[PDB]
Structures are given as C-alpha cells and as structure tokens.
Coordinates of C-alpha atoms and ligand atoms in Angstrom, one line a residue:
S1 CA -37.0 -79.5 -56.2
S2 CA -35.1 -82.9 -56.3
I3 CA -32.5 -82.8 -59.1
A4 CA -32.2 -79.0 -59.8
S5 CA -32.3 -77.9 -56.2
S6 CA -30.8 -74.5 -55.4
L7 CA -29.3 -74.4 -52.0
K8 CA -31.9 -72.6 -49.9
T9 CA -31.4 -69.7 -47.6
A10 CA -32.4 -70.0 -43.9
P11 CA -35.1 -67.9 -42.5
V12 CA -34.6 -64.7 -40.5
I13 CA -36.6 -63.5 -37.5
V14 CA -37.5 -59.8 -37.2
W15 CA -38.5 -59.0 -33.6
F16 CA -40.7 -55.9 -33.4
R17 CA -41.0 -53.9 -30.1
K18 CA -41.5 -50.1 -30.3
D19 CA -40.6 -49.8 -34.0
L20 CA -44.0 -50.6 -35.6
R21 CA -43.2 -49.5 -39.1
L22 CA -42.0 -50.9 -42.4
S23 CA -40.3 -47.6 -43.5
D24 CA -36.8 -46.5 -42.5
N25 CA -36.5 -49.8 -40.7
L26 CA -32.9 -51.0 -40.9
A27 CA -33.6 -54.3 -39.1
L28 CA -36.4 -55.2 -41.6
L29 CA -34.1 -54.1 -44.5
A30 CA -31.4 -56.4 -43.1
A31 CA -33.9 -59.3 -43.1
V32 CA -34.7 -58.6 -46.7
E33 CA -30.9 -58.4 -47.6
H34 CA -30.4 -61.7 -45.7
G35 CA -32.7 -63.5 -48.1
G36 CA -35.0 -66.5 -47.3
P37 CA -38.2 -66.4 -45.3
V38 CA -38.9 -63.3 -43.1
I39 CA -40.6 -64.2 -39.8
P40 CA -41.9 -61.0 -38.1
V41 CA -42.8 -61.4 -34.4
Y42 CA -44.1 -59.2 -31.7
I43 CA -43.7 -60.5 -28.2
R44 CA -45.7 -59.5 -25.1
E45 CA -42.8 -59.2 -22.6
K46 CA -43.3 -58.9 -18.9
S47 CA -41.2 -55.8 -18.3
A48 CA -41.3 -53.8 -21.6
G49 CA -44.3 -52.7 -23.6
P50 CA -47.1 -50.1 -23.2
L51 CA -46.5 -47.8 -20.3
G52 CA -50.2 -47.7 -19.4
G53 CA -53.9 -48.0 -20.3
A54 CA -53.9 -45.3 -23.0
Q55 CA -50.8 -46.8 -24.6
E56 CA -52.5 -50.3 -24.6
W57 CA -55.3 -48.7 -26.7
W58 CA -52.6 -47.4 -29.0
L59 CA -50.7 -50.7 -29.1
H60 CA -53.8 -52.7 -30.2
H61 CA -54.5 -50.4 -33.1
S62 CA -50.8 -50.2 -34.0
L63 CA -50.4 -54.0 -34.1
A64 CA -53.5 -54.3 -36.2
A65 CA -52.2 -51.7 -38.7
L66 CA -48.7 -53.3 -38.8
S67 CA -50.2 -56.8 -39.3
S68 CA -52.3 -55.4 -42.2
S69 CA -49.2 -53.7 -43.8
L70 CA -47.1 -56.9 -43.5
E71 CA -49.9 -59.0 -45.1
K72 CA -50.0 -56.5 -48.0
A73 CA -46.3 -57.3 -48.5
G74 CA -46.9 -61.1 -48.4
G75 CA -46.0 -61.6 -44.8
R76 CA -47.7 -61.9 -41.4
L77 CA -47.1 -60.8 -37.9
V78 CA -46.7 -63.6 -35.4
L79 CA -48.0 -62.7 -31.9
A80 CA -46.6 -64.4 -28.8
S81 CA -46.6 -63.9 -25.1
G82 CA -44.1 -64.8 -22.4
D83 CA -40.3 -65.2 -22.1
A84 CA -38.5 -63.7 -25.1
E85 CA -35.6 -66.1 -25.1
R86 CA -38.0 -69.2 -24.9
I87 CA -40.2 -67.7 -27.7
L88 CA -37.3 -66.9 -29.9
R89 CA -35.6 -70.3 -29.4
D90 CA -38.9 -72.0 -30.2
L91 CA -39.3 -69.9 -33.4
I92 CA -35.7 -70.6 -34.4
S93 CA -36.2 -74.4 -33.8
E94 CA -39.4 -74.5 -35.8
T95 CA -38.4 -72.4 -38.8
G96 CA -34.7 -73.2 -38.9
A97 CA -33.8 -69.4 -38.8
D98 CA -30.1 -68.6 -38.5
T99 CA -30.6 -64.9 -37.6
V100 CA -32.6 -62.7 -35.3
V101 CA -32.7 -59.0 -36.0
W102 CA -34.2 -56.1 -34.1
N103 CA -34.1 -52.3 -33.8
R104 CA -32.2 -51.0 -30.8
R105 CA -34.2 -49.6 -27.9
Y106 CA -32.4 -47.1 -25.9
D107 CA -34.2 -47.1 -22.5
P108 CA -31.6 -48.7 -20.2
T109 CA -33.9 -51.6 -19.0
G110 CA -34.8 -52.6 -22.6
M111 CA -31.2 -52.2 -23.7
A112 CA -30.0 -54.4 -20.8
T113 CA -32.6 -57.1 -21.7
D114 CA -31.4 -57.0 -25.3
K115 CA -27.7 -57.2 -24.3
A116 CA -28.3 -60.3 -22.2
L117 CA -30.5 -62.0 -24.7
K118 CA -28.1 -61.3 -27.6
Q119 CA -25.2 -62.9 -25.7
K120 CA -27.2 -66.0 -24.8
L121 CA -28.3 -66.5 -28.5
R122 CA -24.8 -65.8 -29.8
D123 CA -23.4 -68.3 -27.3
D124 CA -25.6 -71.0 -29.0
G125 CA -24.3 -70.0 -32.5
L126 CA -27.1 -67.8 -33.7
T127 CA -26.5 -64.5 -35.5
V128 CA -28.0 -61.5 -33.8
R129 CA -27.9 -58.0 -35.2
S130 CA -29.4 -54.8 -33.8
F131 CA -29.9 -51.5 -35.6
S132 CA -30.1 -47.7 -35.1
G133 CA -33.3 -45.8 -35.9
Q134 CA -35.1 -44.8 -32.7
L135 CA -32.8 -41.8 -32.1
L136 CA -30.8 -39.3 -34.3
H137 CA -27.8 -39.7 -32.0
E138 CA -26.1 -42.5 -30.1
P139 CA -26.3 -41.7 -26.4
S140 CA -23.5 -44.0 -25.5
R141 CA -21.1 -42.4 -27.9
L142 CA -21.9 -38.7 -28.1
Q143 CA -19.9 -36.5 -25.7
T144 CA -19.0 -32.9 -25.3
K145 CA -15.9 -31.5 -26.9
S146 CA -14.3 -32.1 -23.4
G147 CA -15.4 -35.7 -23.1
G148 CA -18.4 -35.4 -20.9
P149 CA -22.1 -36.4 -21.1
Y150 CA -24.3 -33.5 -22.3
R151 CA -26.0 -32.1 -19.1
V152 CA -27.4 -28.9 -20.8
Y153 CA -29.7 -28.6 -23.7
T154 CA -28.3 -25.8 -25.8
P155 CA -24.8 -27.3 -26.4
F156 CA -26.4 -30.7 -27.2
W157 CA -28.7 -29.0 -29.7
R158 CA -25.8 -27.2 -31.3
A159 CA -23.9 -30.6 -31.6
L160 CA -26.9 -32.3 -33.3
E161 CA -27.7 -29.2 -35.4
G162 CA -24.0 -29.1 -36.5
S163 CA -23.7 -32.8 -37.2
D164 CA -23.9 -34.2 -40.7
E165 CA -27.5 -34.5 -41.7
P166 CA -29.1 -37.6 -40.4
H167 CA -29.0 -40.1 -43.2
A168 CA -32.2 -39.8 -45.4
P169 CA -34.9 -42.3 -44.6
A170 CA -34.9 -45.7 -46.4
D171 CA -37.9 -47.0 -48.4
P172 CA -40.1 -49.7 -47.0
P173 CA -39.8 -53.1 -48.7
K174 CA -42.9 -53.7 -50.9
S175 CA -42.6 -57.5 -50.7
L176 CA -41.4 -60.0 -48.0
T177 CA -40.5 -63.6 -48.6
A178 CA -42.8 -65.9 -46.6
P179 CA -42.2 -69.3 -45.2
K180 CA -44.2 -72.2 -46.7
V181 CA -45.6 -72.9 -43.2
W182 CA -46.2 -70.0 -40.7
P183 CA -45.6 -70.5 -37.0
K184 CA -48.8 -70.4 -35.0
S185 CA -49.8 -66.9 -33.7
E186 CA -51.9 -65.7 -30.7
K187 CA -55.0 -63.7 -31.4
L188 CA -54.7 -59.9 -30.8
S189 CA -58.3 -59.8 -29.4
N190 CA -57.2 -62.1 -26.6
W191 CA -54.6 -59.6 -25.3
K192 CA -57.4 -57.4 -23.8
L193 CA -55.7 -54.2 -24.9
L194 CA -58.9 -52.3 -25.6
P195 CA -61.4 -50.8 -23.3
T196 CA -64.8 -52.6 -23.3
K197 CA -67.5 -51.0 -21.2
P198 CA -67.3 -48.1 -20.8
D199 CA -65.3 -47.2 -23.8
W200 CA -63.3 -44.5 -22.1
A201 CA -61.2 -44.1 -25.2
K202 CA -64.2 -43.3 -27.4
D203 CA -62.9 -39.9 -28.3
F204 CA -59.3 -41.0 -28.9
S205 CA -60.2 -41.8 -32.5
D206 CA -61.3 -38.1 -33.1
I207 CA -57.6 -37.2 -32.7
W208 CA -55.6 -40.4 -33.4
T209 CA -55.0 -43.1 -36.0
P210 CA -52.4 -45.3 -34.6
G211 CA -49.8 -46.9 -36.9
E212 CA -47.4 -46.0 -39.7
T213 CA -50.0 -44.7 -42.2
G214 CA -51.4 -42.5 -39.5
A215 CA -47.9 -41.3 -38.6
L216 CA -47.2 -40.3 -42.2
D217 CA -50.6 -38.6 -42.5
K218 CA -49.7 -36.5 -39.3
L219 CA -46.3 -35.7 -40.7
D220 CA -47.7 -34.8 -44.2
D221 CA -50.4 -32.6 -42.7
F222 CA -48.0 -30.8 -40.4
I223 CA -45.4 -30.0 -43.2
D224 CA -48.2 -28.8 -45.5
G225 CA -49.9 -27.1 -42.5
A226 CA -49.1 -26.0 -39.0
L227 CA -45.3 -26.0 -39.6
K228 CA -46.1 -22.6 -40.9
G229 CA -46.3 -20.4 -37.8
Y230 CA -45.2 -23.2 -35.5
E231 CA -42.7 -21.1 -33.6
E232 CA -45.3 -18.4 -32.7
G233 CA -48.3 -20.8 -32.3
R234 CA -46.9 -23.6 -30.2
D235 CA -47.2 -21.7 -26.9
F236 CA -51.0 -21.3 -27.1
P237 CA -53.0 -24.4 -26.2
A238 CA -56.2 -23.2 -27.9
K239 CA -54.3 -23.3 -31.2
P240 CA -53.9 -26.6 -33.1
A241 CA -50.3 -25.5 -34.0
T242 CA -48.2 -28.6 -33.1
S243 CA -47.5 -31.8 -35.1
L244 CA -49.2 -34.4 -32.8
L245 CA -46.4 -36.8 -33.8
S246 CA -45.5 -37.7 -30.2
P247 CA -47.3 -41.0 -29.9
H248 CA -46.2 -42.1 -33.3
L249 CA -42.6 -41.3 -32.4
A250 CA -43.0 -43.1 -29.0
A251 CA -44.4 -46.2 -30.7
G252 CA -41.6 -46.1 -33.5
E253 CA -44.3 -45.8 -36.2
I254 CA -42.1 -43.1 -37.8
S255 CA -38.3 -42.4 -37.3
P256 CA -37.0 -39.0 -36.1
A257 CA -34.7 -39.1 -39.3
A258 CA -37.9 -39.2 -41.5
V259 CA -39.4 -36.3 -39.6
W260 CA -36.1 -34.3 -39.8
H261 CA -35.7 -35.0 -43.6
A262 CA -39.3 -33.9 -44.2
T263 CA -38.3 -30.4 -43.0
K264 CA -35.6 -30.1 -45.7
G265 CA -36.1 -28.2 -49.0
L266 CA -39.0 -26.1 -47.8
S267 CA -37.6 -22.5 -48.2
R268 CA -40.0 -21.6 -51.1
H269 CA -42.9 -21.7 -48.5
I270 CA -41.6 -22.0 -44.9
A271 CA -39.6 -19.7 -42.7
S272 CA -36.3 -21.0 -41.4
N273 CA -37.3 -20.0 -37.8
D274 CA -40.3 -22.4 -37.8
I275 CA -38.2 -25.2 -39.1
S276 CA -35.4 -24.5 -36.6
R277 CA -37.9 -24.4 -33.7
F278 CA -39.6 -27.7 -34.7
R279 CA -36.1 -29.3 -35.1
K280 CA -35.3 -28.2 -31.6
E281 CA -38.3 -30.0 -30.2
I282 CA -37.3 -33.2 -32.0
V283 CA -33.9 -32.7 -30.3
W284 CA -35.6 -32.2 -26.9
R285 CA -36.7 -35.9 -27.3
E286 CA -33.1 -36.8 -28.1
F287 CA -31.9 -34.9 -25.0
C288 CA -34.4 -36.7 -22.8
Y289 CA -33.0 -40.1 -24.0
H290 CA -29.4 -38.8 -23.5
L291 CA -30.2 -38.0 -19.8
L292 CA -32.0 -41.3 -19.3
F293 CA -28.9 -43.2 -20.7
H294 CA -26.7 -41.3 -18.3
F295 CA -29.1 -41.5 -15.4
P296 CA -31.2 -44.7 -15.7
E297 CA -33.1 -43.9 -12.4
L298 CA -34.5 -40.7 -14.0
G299 CA -38.1 -41.9 -13.4
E300 CA -37.6 -42.9 -9.7
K301 CA -34.7 -40.9 -8.1
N302 CA -34.1 -37.2 -7.9
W303 CA -31.4 -36.1 -10.4
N304 CA -30.4 -33.6 -7.6
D305 CA -30.2 -35.6 -4.4
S306 CA -30.6 -32.4 -2.3
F307 CA -34.3 -33.0 -2.9
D308 CA -34.3 -36.4 -1.3
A309 CA -35.3 -35.1 2.1
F310 CA -38.1 -32.9 0.6
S311 CA -41.3 -33.5 2.7
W312 CA -44.2 -34.1 0.3
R313 CA -47.8 -33.8 1.5
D314 CA -49.7 -37.0 2.2
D315 CA -52.9 -35.8 0.6
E316 CA -54.5 -38.3 -1.7
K317 CA -57.7 -36.3 -1.8
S318 CA -55.9 -33.3 -3.5
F319 CA -54.1 -35.7 -5.8
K320 CA -57.4 -37.2 -6.9
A321 CA -58.8 -33.7 -7.5
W322 CA -55.8 -33.0 -9.7
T323 CA -56.2 -36.3 -11.7
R324 CA -59.9 -35.4 -12.3
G325 CA -59.4 -31.8 -13.2
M326 CA -61.3 -30.6 -10.2
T327 CA -58.7 -28.2 -8.7
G328 CA -60.9 -25.0 -9.3
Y329 CA -58.0 -23.5 -11.4
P330 CA -59.6 -23.6 -15.0
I331 CA -56.3 -23.9 -17.0
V332 CA -55.2 -26.8 -14.8
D333 CA -58.6 -28.4 -15.0
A334 CA -58.8 -28.0 -18.8
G335 CA -55.4 -29.8 -19.2
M336 CA -56.3 -32.7 -17.0
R337 CA -59.7 -33.1 -18.7
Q338 CA -58.0 -32.9 -22.2
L339 CA -55.7 -35.7 -21.0
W340 CA -58.6 -37.8 -19.8
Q341 CA -60.6 -37.3 -23.1
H342 CA -57.9 -37.5 -25.8
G343 CA -54.9 -39.2 -24.2
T344 CA -52.7 -36.1 -24.6
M345 CA -52.1 -32.6 -23.3
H346 CA -50.7 -29.4 -24.8
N347 CA -47.0 -29.1 -23.7
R348 CA -47.5 -25.7 -22.1
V349 CA -50.4 -27.1 -20.1
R350 CA -48.3 -30.2 -19.1
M351 CA -45.8 -27.8 -17.5
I352 CA -48.6 -25.9 -15.8
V353 CA -50.4 -29.0 -14.4
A354 CA -47.1 -30.6 -13.3
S355 CA -46.1 -27.4 -11.5
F356 CA -49.5 -27.2 -9.9
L357 CA -49.1 -30.8 -8.5
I358 CA -45.5 -30.4 -7.2
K359 CA -45.7 -26.8 -5.9
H360 CA -49.3 -25.8 -5.2
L361 CA -50.3 -29.3 -3.8
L362 CA -46.8 -30.3 -2.7
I363 CA -47.3 -33.8 -4.0
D364 CA -44.5 -36.1 -5.0
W365 CA -43.7 -35.6 -8.7
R366 CA -43.4 -39.4 -9.1
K367 CA -47.2 -39.6 -8.5
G368 CA -47.8 -37.2 -11.4
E369 CA -45.3 -39.1 -13.6
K370 CA -47.2 -42.4 -12.9
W371 CA -50.6 -40.7 -13.7
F372 CA -49.1 -39.5 -17.0
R373 CA -47.7 -43.0 -17.7
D374 CA -51.3 -44.4 -17.5
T375 CA -53.1 -41.7 -19.5
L376 CA -50.7 -40.5 -22.3
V377 CA -50.8 -42.2 -25.6
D378 CA -47.2 -40.8 -26.0
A379 CA -45.9 -41.9 -22.6
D380 CA -42.2 -42.2 -23.0
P381 CA -39.7 -43.5 -20.4
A382 CA -37.2 -40.7 -21.1
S383 CA -39.4 -37.7 -21.9
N384 CA -42.0 -38.2 -19.2
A385 CA -39.4 -38.6 -16.4
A386 CA -37.1 -35.9 -17.7
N387 CA -39.8 -33.3 -18.0
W388 CA -41.2 -34.0 -14.6
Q389 CA -37.7 -33.6 -13.1
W390 CA -37.2 -30.2 -14.8
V391 CA -40.6 -29.0 -13.5
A392 CA -39.6 -30.3 -10.0
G393 CA -36.3 -28.3 -10.0
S394 CA -33.7 -31.0 -10.8
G395 CA -31.2 -30.5 -13.7
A396 CA -29.3 -27.7 -15.5
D397 CA -32.4 -26.9 -17.6
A398 CA -34.8 -27.0 -14.6
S399 CA -36.6 -23.9 -13.4
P400 CA -35.5 -23.2 -9.8
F401 CA -38.0 -24.6 -7.3
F402 CA -38.6 -21.1 -5.8
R403 CA -40.0 -19.9 -9.2
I404 CA -43.7 -20.4 -8.7
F405 CA -46.2 -18.8 -11.1
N406 CA -49.9 -18.4 -10.6
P407 CA -51.8 -20.8 -12.9
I408 CA -54.3 -17.9 -13.3
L409 CA -51.6 -15.7 -14.8
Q410 CA -50.2 -18.5 -17.0
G411 CA -53.8 -19.1 -18.2
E412 CA -54.4 -15.4 -19.0
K413 CA -50.9 -15.2 -20.8
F414 CA -51.2 -18.3 -23.0
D415 CA -55.1 -18.6 -23.3
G416 CA -56.2 -14.9 -23.0
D417 CA -59.6 -15.3 -24.7
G418 CA -60.2 -18.5 -22.7
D419 CA -60.9 -20.7 -25.8
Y420 CA -58.9 -23.7 -24.5
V421 CA -60.6 -23.4 -21.1
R422 CA -64.1 -23.2 -22.7
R423 CA -63.3 -26.3 -24.8
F424 CA -62.5 -28.5 -21.9
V425 CA -64.4 -26.8 -19.1
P426 CA -67.6 -26.0 -21.0
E427 CA -69.5 -25.2 -17.8
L428 CA -67.5 -21.9 -17.8
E429 CA -68.5 -21.2 -21.5
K430 CA -70.5 -18.0 -20.7
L431 CA -67.9 -16.3 -18.5
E432 CA -66.2 -13.3 -20.0
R433 CA -62.4 -13.4 -20.4
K434 CA -62.0 -11.1 -17.3
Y435 CA -63.1 -14.0 -15.1
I436 CA -62.6 -17.2 -17.2
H437 CA -59.3 -18.1 -15.5
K438 CA -60.4 -16.9 -12.0
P439 CA -64.2 -17.6 -11.7
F440 CA -63.7 -17.4 -7.9
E441 CA -62.9 -13.7 -8.2
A442 CA -66.0 -12.9 -10.2
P443 CA -69.0 -11.1 -8.6
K444 CA -72.3 -12.9 -7.9
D445 CA -74.1 -11.0 -10.8
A446 CA -71.6 -12.2 -13.4
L447 CA -71.6 -15.8 -12.1
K448 CA -75.4 -15.8 -12.1
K449 CA -75.5 -14.5 -15.7
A450 CA -73.0 -17.1 -16.8
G451 CA -74.9 -20.0 -15.1
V452 CA -72.0 -20.8 -12.8
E453 CA -72.5 -21.8 -9.2
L454 CA -69.2 -22.3 -7.5
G455 CA -69.2 -25.5 -5.5
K456 CA -71.8 -27.2 -7.8
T457 CA -71.2 -26.3 -11.5
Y458 CA -67.5 -25.8 -11.0
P459 CA -65.4 -26.2 -7.8
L460 CA -63.8 -23.4 -5.7
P461 CA -60.0 -23.4 -5.7
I462 CA -58.8 -26.4 -3.7
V463 CA -55.9 -24.3 -2.4
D464 CA -55.3 -20.5 -2.1
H465 CA -52.5 -19.4 -4.4
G466 CA -50.8 -17.2 -1.7
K467 CA -51.0 -19.8 1.0
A468 CA -49.9 -22.6 -1.4
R469 CA -46.9 -20.5 -2.4
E470 CA -45.9 -19.8 1.2
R471 CA -46.2 -23.5 2.0
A472 CA -44.0 -24.6 -1.0
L473 CA -41.3 -22.0 -0.1
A474 CA -41.4 -23.1 3.5
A475 CA -40.9 -26.7 2.4
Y476 CA -38.0 -25.6 0.2
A477 CA -36.4 -23.7 3.1
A478 CA -36.8 -26.9 5.3
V479 CA -35.1 -29.2 2.7
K480 CA -32.1 -26.8 2.6
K481 CA -31.7 -27.2 6.3
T482 CA -31.2 -31.0 5.6
Ligands
LIG501 C1 -44.8 -33.0 -17.4 C2 -44.4 -33.4 -18.8 C3 -44.5 -34.7 -19.2 C4 -44.3 -35.1 -20.5 N1 -44.3 -36.4 -21.0 C5 -44.0 -36.7 -22.2 C6 -44.1 -38.1 -22.7 O1 -44.4 -39.0 -21.9 N2 -43.8 -38.4 -24.0 C7 -43.4 -37.4 -24.9 O2 -43.2 -37.6 -26.1 N3 -43.4 -36.1 -24.5 C8 -43.6 -35.7 -23.2 N4 -43.6 -34.3 -22.9 C9 -43.1 -33.4 -23.8 C10 -44.1 -32.6 -24.7 O3 -45.1 -32.0 -23.9 C11 -44.7 -33.5 -25.7 O4 -43.7 -34.2 -26.5 C12 -45.6 -32.7 -26.7 O5 -46.8 -32.3 -25.9 C13 -46.1 -33.6 -27.8 O6 -47.0 -32.8 -28.7 P1 -46.5 -32.7 -30.3 O7 -46.1 -34.0 -30.8 O8 -47.6 -32.0 -31.0 O9 -45.2 -31.8 -30.1 P2 -44.5 -30.9 -31.3 O10 -44.5 -29.5 -30.7 O11 -45.1 -31.1 -32.6 O12 -43.0 -31.4 -31.1 C14 -42.5 -32.4 -32.0 C15 -41.9 -33.6 -31.2 O13 -40.8 -33.2 -30.4 C16 -40.8 -33.9 -29.2 N5 -40.9 -33.0 -28.1 C17 -41.5 -31.8 -28.1 N6 -41.3 -31.2 -26.9 C18 -40.7 -32.0 -26.1 C19 -40.2 -32.0 -24.7 N7 -40.5 -30.9 -23.9 N8 -39.6 -33.1 -24.2 C20 -39.3 -34.1 -25.0 N9 -39.7 -34.2 -26.3 C21 -40.4 -33.2 -26.8 C22 -41.9 -34.9 -29.3 O14 -41.4 -36.2 -29.8 C23 -42.8 -34.2 -30.3 O15 -43.7 -35.1 -31.0 C24 -43.9 -34.0 -21.5 C25 -43.8 -32.7 -21.0 C26 -44.1 -32.3 -19.8 C27 -43.9 -30.9 -19.3
LIG502 N1 -56.3 -40.7 -21.4 C1 -56.9 -41.6 -20.7 N2 -58.3 -41.5 -20.4 C2 -59.0 -42.4 -19.7 O1 -60.2 -42.3 -19.5 C3 -58.2 -43.5 -19.1 C4 -56.8 -43.6 -19.4 N3 -56.2 -42.7 -20.2 N4 -56.0 -44.6 -18.9 C5 -56.7 -45.8 -18.3 C6 -57.9 -45.3 -17.4 C7 -58.8 -46.4 -16.9 N5 -60.1 -46.2 -17.6 C8 -61.4 -46.5 -17.0 C9 -61.6 -47.9 -16.7 C10 -62.8 -48.3 -16.1 C11 -63.8 -47.4 -15.9 C12 -65.1 -47.9 -15.3 O2 -65.2 -49.1 -15.3 N6 -66.1 -47.1 -15.0 C13 -67.4 -47.5 -14.6 C14 -67.7 -47.1 -13.1 C15 -66.5 -47.2 -12.2 C16 -65.5 -46.0 -12.3 O3 -65.9 -45.0 -12.9 O4 -64.4 -46.1 -11.7 C17 -68.4 -46.8 -15.4 O5 -69.1 -47.4 -16.3 O6 -68.6 -45.5 -15.3 C18 -63.6 -46.1 -16.2 C19 -62.4 -45.6 -16.7 C20 -60.1 -44.8 -18.0 N7 -58.7 -44.5 -18.3

C-alpha cells in the first residue's frame, strides 16, 4: 500500500427511501458499477416516509430485513434522522464519496425534494444520478397519441399493454464493497416505529412478512397459486384470490417490472384472461401515479371543482362509528374490522366502505382518505387519493355521484353465503344467509336463535338506507345550484 499503490476509487452513497430491495435496483447496480465502497443510507426525513401507524410497523420490519440482506452482501445500512442535505453532505465529507445515487420517487412532493437537493449537490461538484424502477411508465413523458395526459383508464392500459415489454428485472448484487471504516448509524429501535402496549399490530404477522424476501414469497405463491382463477375470484372478499403484493409494491420491496415479468411464459398452466386481468390491476397503480403527477393536489382538492361547494355533514360521531366498524351494515363493518386487524382491506370492500362514508354518512372523503393513510400497510399517496376521488364522483372513471347502491345488496352480491362477514363480525356467525347482511330485518325468533341482540351484540343501522339516499341526492341537487 506504499510503493505498489493502485489509485483507489472514491465511495458512492446509495440513498434508500421506498425502494427497500436489492433486486431490480438500478441505483444499487449503478453504485456497484461505479466501484469503490458502497455506503447505503436510509434517512428519516420530515416530510416523506410512512404515511401512518400501520406503515411505520411495516417500515420497521422492512428496514430490519434490508439491513440483514445488506450485511449478507458484506455491507450495512446506515440509519440517520434529520435534514437530507446536511446528512448527505456529512456522509460525503466523512467518506470522501464522489457520487450519490437514488431511485426516483414519483409522488410530486418527493420528486420536488429530490430535484432541489440534486441541484444543490451538483452545484458543489458532486455527481448525482437517479433511476427508474418504481413505475413501468414515465408519467412526465407518456402522452396520448394527441399529446395529452391520460385522463381515462382504458386508453392508458392499451398504451402500456401495447408498449415494448418492460425490461426484464436485473439480478441483485451478491457482494458489496465496504469502506474500511463505517460511518456511525442510529439504532432502529430508537425510532419508535413499532407498537408497544397494546400491540395492536399483533395479527399483522399472520398476513404479512415485510421486506424483499416476503415480497418474492408473495409473488411466487401468487404465480403458483391464486393467479389461477384470479379474474373470477377477485370480486369476492371471502376468497383469498388476490396477490397481497400491495404493501410490498408501496414500499418498493419488489418492482412492478419484476411482477409483470413473472406473468410471462405461463400458458402451459394459466389462462390468458387471468394474466390480462392481473396486469390491468398493476396498470391501475400506474394510472393512479399518472393522475397524481398531472394533479399533485389529488389528496386534498377535488379533481372536479364543481364539488367544492358540496355541504358535508359535521358528524364526528358517525365518522367514529365508521372507523370502528359499528355502522350496523355487516359488510361495511367487516371491512373496517378487517382493516383494523390486518392493516388491509379487500378492494371491493374498500369501494363499499368508501361509498358508505361519502354517500350514506355524507362525510368528507378526505377524512376517509386520512383514516386509510393511518391504517393501511399499503397506503400510497397516488392510489389512496385517486380511489377515494373516483368513489366520490370526480374523474372520467368515477361512478356518478347519483349512483348509490345499498351496502346490503352489495354484500349479498359479493358475499352471498356471508363468509367474509362471519369472519370479521363473528357475533353474527349463527345467522342464516337470508339475514346475515341485514340482521335488522330478521324476526325476533331468528335473532334469538342466533344469539344476536341488536343494540348490544351488534348495532342497529346508524342510518336508514332510504333516508340516507334521499339526503345524499338532496345534497347533490344543492351543489348543482352552486
Ligand atoms: C378507497 C380505496 C383506497 C385505496 N387505497 C389504496 C392504497 O393506499 N394503496 C394501494 O396500493 N391501493 C389502494 N387501493 C386499491 C386496491 O384496493 C388495493 O391495491 C388492493 O386492495 C390491494 O390488494 P392486492 O395487492 O391483493 O391486489 P391485487 O388484486 O393482487 O392487484 C395487484 C396490484 O395492483 C395494484 N392495484 C390493484 N387494484 C388497484 C386500484 N384499484 N388502484 C390502484 N392500484 C391497484 C396494487 O399495487 C396491487 O398490489 C384503494 C382502493 C380503494 C377503493
Ligand atoms: N390497521 C391498523 N390497526 C390498528 O389497530 C391501528 C392502525 N392501523 N394504525 C395506528 C392505530 C393506533 N393504534 C392504537 C394505539 C394505542 C392504543 C391504546 O393505547 N389503547 C389502550 C387504551 C386507549 C385506547 O384504546 O384508545 C389500550 O390498552 O386498550 C390502541 C390502538 C391502533 N392503530
């Protein structure tokens, strides 16, 4: 190291955010190609990070898993809290790194943070490079054949379906070059991301294994499992027919290109309709990000400003009943209880509970959006906002506001035998399917036999369907006169 000294390569910093994976990670691969020591860092920023309590549980386990995977490769994960610029400059100064890399994040606030930071670092002569991976498409570049943003799903789907296959996923690096001396790291346990007493996430582990290995296990199981019959099965919440990839995708533990490529070459065993339908759902995520790019206020302002003057009820009591799954409408209650217990909800039931809040209770959709932000492990700044707005009646793909279905009928249509309701509202277990979705219409004899006392065992409906419907349509008529 004195007289036969090779000229050494400077380190490179890899800044992880919602891309907590080693596979199909172009930033990490760039760091490997760069040579020299690789310095992985995760920063607890003020603005960005987990959208709520459930996602903090997710993040803890995700960071623990990523750290373990990096250590297996010979690296480590540096943890730091505070101002990203100050932290990165301090790491640069300490290590002598000449480059910072990251994977692009496409939520407008995070993208703006990155743009500003990138310019500041470049102005001081640092190399900064950002990479695709979070999305199959580039929202700032993709336009209709006539030069517009996509406003409607089907043409957007046809564009992505018709595009050259997303590039196949890149392998993870098996080894990372480490610095001789590691920068100091914060302790994950000190970040207070986990519940303590009570452990309200105690059943999350029954469903979830956060991190890249868990993501790949979910993908593998889906391809070898529920992908078969997915198209027919996905509408029925009692059936475990979906992939459960959403929080892994949200956390960037698996790329959508990896998911897409996993659906290729399956014709010997899998019907094309199931694959097409699953791909469409992946593209719904893409579309939500497209809309967020084109309308950054998607989570706070109505897409259709005709709704701005809508007069929402000031009824925090009904809102609380909704959050607790105590509406007296079993399918709604089942969904809200599923969410509380497992940090997720079947998509059909998300639509039903969202509609119940907005139309039956006439409560501001933003309140429902915020509740979901705190309780979903998959909370996503594009998909949550976009879906709430569609249920609320804004957007080309929105159901018109005046379309108001009875939760009872939706329950009987998509959960006819009542298995989903019985799973999450077990106090109704003994009711026959005739009354499982409408226990308030059952006769005294049946309620007695099933061990159900309305108002004790299970609540009466907090609103009458007919009256709620009249109220919502009157509110719709009023907003038109504005
Ligand atoms: C009111 C409301 C709020 C929602 N909030 C979120 C959210 O915060 N995060 C989130 O990822 N999804 C959200 N969704 C969409 C959808 O309900 C979930 O993606 C789905 O329940 C996830 O289960 P899965 O992974 O088994 O889906 P699968 O059926 O296996 O679908 C595969 C993937 O496609 C994507 N996807 C599927 N459906 C949709 C959709 N309607 N919109 C956008 N992406 C979709 C997801 O990434 C999902 O993992 C919301 C839907 C509604 C109606
Ligand atoms: N999906 C999901 N499920 C949840 O249960 C959940 C979320 N998400 N997101 C965050 C909130 C907050 N969590 C909490 C936090 C504290 C208490 C708690 O301290 N409970 C006391 C009594 C006070 C009370 O219930 O408010 C207890 O020991 O029962 C309960 C739930 C549950 N949370």
